[PDB]
Ligand binder design. Structure first.
Ligand SMILES: NNC(=O)c1ccccc1OCc1ccccc1
Length: 284
């Protein structure tokens, strides 16, 4: 059923809350035993948001391999994503270790360091060229190379150096800076523009490791980003673009990380970004 018509039918009936609860009820439940070990309590930002054991990213160290991060593997779309929480003061070194080990090209950040007067994630990248960051626990160095500040997002070029081998890589930081403190954006225009800039970079391409995507918990805004991307890529690839069922795509993604899309408003917004993206590829 054309997701456009399904969208008007839900809006006219005001049933967003009822669709959203049906998704929550049918979503997968898998064990997260590593996340709940006592040695990992300070590695988790939220007690109710954990990676499943089957899909968690492992750090390449014998001490403790745990990070709050999940590999989303979309078989039909041939797209992969690492969804993770905003780094904590004691997990900034782990975060950059994961970027290095997974061979990611891009980091996508969908939150501000402070929102609603509280800290949502650590200041985990350098703000001045001449003041680099060293992570002594994981033996990495991170330098700001350049910064391009636009109205709705900032793109940064970073240099990550493995101090053990003296290899360096260029990492692109895509920072969406205008998501509102409450609710969702009124138009998906600036979000959809951001996604297309991420893609243009090569960060979402198979010659690199998976893109790292985060917000504060790594499930809400982060969920919207990967759902929108996968949706639009399937429409490009299938003989019948109207066969793309956003609710079925979201349940497949929830096999890999719990809680993706946190509210009925984010579901509606996810619907709108895809419908608007659809109504733009066609040349509306
Ligand atoms: N940005 N990099 C990636 O998405 C990626 C990273 C590692 C391996 C493959 C990747 O994509 C292609 C692909 C996706 C899902 C299944 C099969 C193949």
């Amino acid at each position: 059923m054309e997701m456009e018509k399904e969208f008007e039918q839900i809006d006219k009936s005001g049933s967003w809350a009822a669709i959203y609860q049906d998704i929550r009820h049918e979503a997968s439940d898998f064990p997260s035993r590593v996340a709940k070990l006592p040695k990992n309590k300070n590695r988790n930002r939220y007690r109710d948001v954990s990676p499943f054991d089957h899909s968690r990213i492992k750090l390449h160290q014998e001490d403790n391999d745990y990070i709050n991060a999940s590999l989303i593997k979309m078989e039909e779309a041939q797209r992969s994503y690492i969804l993770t929480q905003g780094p904590l003061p004691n997990t900034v070194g782990h975060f950059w270790e994961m970027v290095w080990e997974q061979k990611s090209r891009g980091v996508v950040m969908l939150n501000r360091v402070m929102e609603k007067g509280s800290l949502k994630c650590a200041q985990y990248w350098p703000q001045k060229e001449e003041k680099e960051m060293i992570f002594e626990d994981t033996n990495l160095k991170l330098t700001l190379i350049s910064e391009d500040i636009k109205s709705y997002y900032t793109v940064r070029q970073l240099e990550l150096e493995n101090l053990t081998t003296q290899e360096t890589r260029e990492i692109l930081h895509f920072h969406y800076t205008t998501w509102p403190d409450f609710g969702v954006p009124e138009s998906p225009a600036s979000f959809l523009n951001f996604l297309f800039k991420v893609r243009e970079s090569g960060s979402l391409s198979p010659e690199h490791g998976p893109v790292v995507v985060h917000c504060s918990a790594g499930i809400g805004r982060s969920g919207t980003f990967c759902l929108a991307d996968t949706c639009l890529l399937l429409m490009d690839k299938r003989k019948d673009p109207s066969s793309v069922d956003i609710k079925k795509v979201l349940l497949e993604m929830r096999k890999f990380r719990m809680g993706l899309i946190q509210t009925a408003d984010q579901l509606r917004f996810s619907y709108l970004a895809v419908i608007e993206g659809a109504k733009f590829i066609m040349g509306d």
